[PDB]
Amino acid sequence: GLPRKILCAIAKKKGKCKGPLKLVCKC
């Protein structure tokens, strides 16, 4: 899988960030 920093770039661009990514990246 992709790194949590790279997943977060996509998550905040699409507007879909959730646990654990939301806690990890502070979305």
Q: How was this structure determined?
A: NMR
Q: How far apart are the first and last CA of the chain?
A: 20
> Which residue matches tokens 């646990």?
19
DSSP the chain: ---HHHHHHHHHHHT---TTHHHHHT-
Return the ∠ at Cα 14 (arms to 7 and 26), rounded to 5°: 55
Q: In whole angstroms, give the CA distance from residue 24 to residue 4.
A: 8
Taking 3-state DSSP, the helix, strand and coil percentages for the chain, each rounded to the nearest 5, stand at: 60, 0, 40
Q: In whole angstroms, give the CA distance from residue 27 to residue 23.
A: 7
